[PDB]
Amino acid sequence: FIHHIFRGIVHAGRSIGRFLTG
């Protein structure tokens, strides 16, 4: 359950970076 919090941070970053690339 704890991992999810850490995993979400890195994942949420990748998604943001993906849009930035376009």
From Swiss-Prot:
One of its GO terms (cellular component) is extracellular region. One of its GO terms (molecular function) is lipid binding. The keyword Nucleotide-binding does not apply. It comes from the Eukaryota. It is found in: Secreted; Membrane. Mast cells in gill, skin and gut, and in lining blood vessels in the viscera. One of its GO terms (biological process) is innate immune response. Pfam families: Antimicrobial12. It is a peripheral membrane protein. Its main location: secreted. InterPro entries: Antimicrobial12 (IPR012515). The modification Glycine amide is found at G22. Keywords: Amidation, Antibiotic, Antimicrobial, Antiviral protein, Cytolysis, Hemolysis, Immunity, Innate immunity, Lipid-binding, Membrane, Secreted. Belongs to the pleurocidin family. Antimicrobial peptide with broad-spectrum activity against Gram-positive and Gram-negative bacteria. Rapidly inactivates both channel catfish herpesvirus (ED(50)=11 uM) and frog virus 3 (ED(50)=16 uM) over a wide temperature range. Has hemolytic activity. This is Piscidin-3. It comes from Morone chrysops x Morone saxatilis (White bass x Striped bass).
